[PDB]
Amino acid sequence: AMNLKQALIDNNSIRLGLSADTWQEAVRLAVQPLIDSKAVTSAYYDAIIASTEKYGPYYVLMPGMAMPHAEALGVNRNAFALITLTKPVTFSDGKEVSVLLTLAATDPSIHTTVAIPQIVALFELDNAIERLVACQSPKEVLEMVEESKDS
């Protein structure tokens, strides 16, 4: 089980400065890099849209970030993806998002025991979302992620 930096490399999962008009557009874009790496199937995007439709945007945990995921489904392999938006997108609860960290798992208890702690740490860094938005290559995204693992 899973290291965020490594997962991101193994999947080549980082996308930088994409553009979306709806939170549906942004979720699609956020899951794409995981369909690209064959970690998940489109049916995973569908499952995110569907769980958002019944539960509301539950994975939007801190200002400026979503970690899109469903209770899974279209998943072959544990993976993370990381995308960065040009302009903040507004989710159906009124929250504004500029960074989506997609999470996929074949076991549901990974989410809180393993994944959220890592995600939490990246975003608990001094000026993270804007730093992340101004990242000019996956290299520095990954450098931010190493910085997360310590202190």
From TrEMBL:
A biological process from GO: phosphoenolpyruvate-dependent sugar phosphotransferase system
Gene3D superfamilies the record matches: Mannitol-specific EII, Chain A
Cellular component, GO annotation: cytoplasm
Keywords in alphabetical order: Cytoplasm, Kinase, Phosphoprotein, Phosphotransferase system, Transferase, Transport
Source organism, top-level taxon: Bacteria
Residues covered by the PTS EIIA type-2 domain: 7-148
Record protein name field: Ascorbate-specific PTS system EIIA component
